[PDB]
Design a protein around this nucleic acid. Structure first.
Length: 117
RNA sequence: AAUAAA
């Protein structure tokens, strides 16, 4: 079967509550491995938290496990999304695949990512 | 899903 490129150790987060600051994501994502950086970009229209953020770790198996355990999860009483960044450039100009959510999230929702080896 | 504000 097909799969996304070797891009790892990074995760986008969206749908955040108005209180999910950097220390909140640091405590919400640490049980899966060991975090190494966090990001809280503003809306840059009124200089306030836009409701989305980023996470990074020193290991790739932690980031992939959070896609398997924190995708469509819930923070602050509301749903949130977790996934590796889409094909738009990232904070360091790195390129990425298209990340089509139909097939990728279908194989992450099914047990097929663990039955195979 | 993002306009990656340290």
């Amino acid at each position: 079967a097909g799969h996304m490129a070797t891009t790892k150790r990074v995760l986008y987060v969206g749908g955040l509550a108005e209180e999910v600051d950097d220390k909140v994501l640091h405590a919400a994502f640490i049980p899966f491995g060991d975090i190494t950086d966090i990001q809280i970009p503003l809306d840059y229209e009124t200089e306030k938290h836009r409701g989305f953020a980023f996470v990074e770790f020193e290991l790739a198996e932690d980031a992939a496990a959070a896609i398997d355990n924190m995708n469509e999860s819930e923070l602050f009483g509301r749903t949130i999304r977790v996934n590796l960044a889409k094909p738009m450039r990232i904070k360091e100009g790195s390129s990425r695949p298209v990340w089509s959510d139909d097939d990728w999230l279908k194989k992450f929702s099914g047990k097929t990512l663990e039955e195979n080896k």
